[PDB]
Structures are given as structure tokens and as C-alpha cells.
């Protein structure tokens, strides 16, 4: 019963196919609530043109800034930020969704798709999701960054939504 | 160090 988004992502303006991402609101209704509506713009903003910004090969793809596009920025759809929901969900394996944030209880709109278990997150970020199909998109993007985290081409989420 | 913050990233 859970939703199910999508995000179509370019590298410089040339197409690298759609993600679709399950999002698990039977364990993190909040948190869930907050992507979906980011994707469907339905409150006034949200993800669309908006850019990976920081991708680490091995590591994960980090995006989600539509605000300040750098990083700093981003907000979720209960404000700036909202609290840590819970820790239920752990960080497996690649093609988990996860929240970014700055510190407990700072979870706004920024987020990364993992490439790898990324344990050591478990019980500091909220995991909410994971890739259904896409993945081989996931790593094209990953091709995309470097160790310092900066990308080789401009990563874009030229389109997102809502498919349940 | 392979964290994902938003805005001071660490090491």
C-alpha cells in the first residue's frame, strides 16, 4: 500500500533514464509524506530541476537542495526542518533512500540514494525507501561524481512525481 | 570521512 515516485534524471541536458523509488510509509509515514509531496509539487515546490549535487562513487547520490542548490539549503514540507521519525529501517545495501541532515532532528528536503551499505548511518539518518527499478541509473549518476564528492557533469532531476 | 550532511560536511 505503500507510494511509489519517480525522478527522470539528465547529465547535461542528455537524458539517463528513471529511478522509481518505494517509500516506506508503513514505517515512516511523515517522512514519507514529506518526499512524495516533494515530488508532486503539490504544496508549491519541491524537487523538479533541481540537482545531485554531491555524488561519492562506492559511497552514495546526494540531492535534494531546490532551495540553495549547494547543500545549505532545502526544506521540507513541515518547514525548515522536522524531527527524526525513527530509526526502524537500516542502511542494507545499495538502493536505499535515506534523509540527509545536519544533526538530530534537522530533516528537511535533502536526501541520497546509497551505493553501498552504509551502516554506520543506521540510528543518525532516517532511511525511508529504496530503489525499485532504476538502479542502473543510479549508477550511471554515480559515474558522474568523484571522491571529493564534486560532479563531473550537471546532474538533473528534470522531471518528478508520483506513481501510486 | 563518507558522511551526508547539509551544510558543514565533515570528514
Not at chain 1, 15 to 39: H, I, Q, S, W, Y
Not at chain 1, 61 to 70: I, K, L, P
Not at chain 1, 80 to 108: C, I, Q, W, Y
Amino acid at each position: 500500500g505503500n507510494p511509489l515516485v519517480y525522478l527522470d534524471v539528465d547529465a547535461n541536458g542528455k537524458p539517463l533514464g528513471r529511478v522509481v523509488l518505494e517509500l516506506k510509509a508503513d514505517v515512516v509515514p511523515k517522512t514519507a509524506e514529506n518526499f512524495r509531496a516533494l515530488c508532486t509539487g503539490e504544496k508549491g515546490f519541491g524537487y523538479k530541476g533541481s540537482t545531485f549535487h554531491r555524488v561519492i562513487p562506492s559511497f552514495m547520490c546526494q540531492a535534494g537542495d531546490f532551495t540553495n542548490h549547494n547543500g545549505t539549503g532545502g526544506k521540507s514540507i513541515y518547514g525548515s526542518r522536522f524531527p527524526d521519525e525513527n530509526f526502524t529501517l537500516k542502511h542494507v545495501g545499495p538502493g536505499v533512500l535515506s534523509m540527509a541532515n545536519a544533526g538530530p532532528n534537522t530533516n528537511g528536503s535533502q536526501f541520497f540514494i546509497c551505493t553501498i551499505k552504509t551502516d554506520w548511518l543506521d540510528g543518525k539518518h532516517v532511511v525511508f525507501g529504496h530503489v525499485i527499478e532504476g538502479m542502473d541509473v543510479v549508477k550511471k549518476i554515480e559515474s558522474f561524481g568523484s571522491k571529493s564528492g564534486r560532479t563531473s557533469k550537471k546532474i538533473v532531476i528534470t522531471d518528478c512525481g508520483q506513481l501510486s | 570521512x563518507l558522511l551526508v550532511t547539509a551544510g558543514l560536511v565533515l570528514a
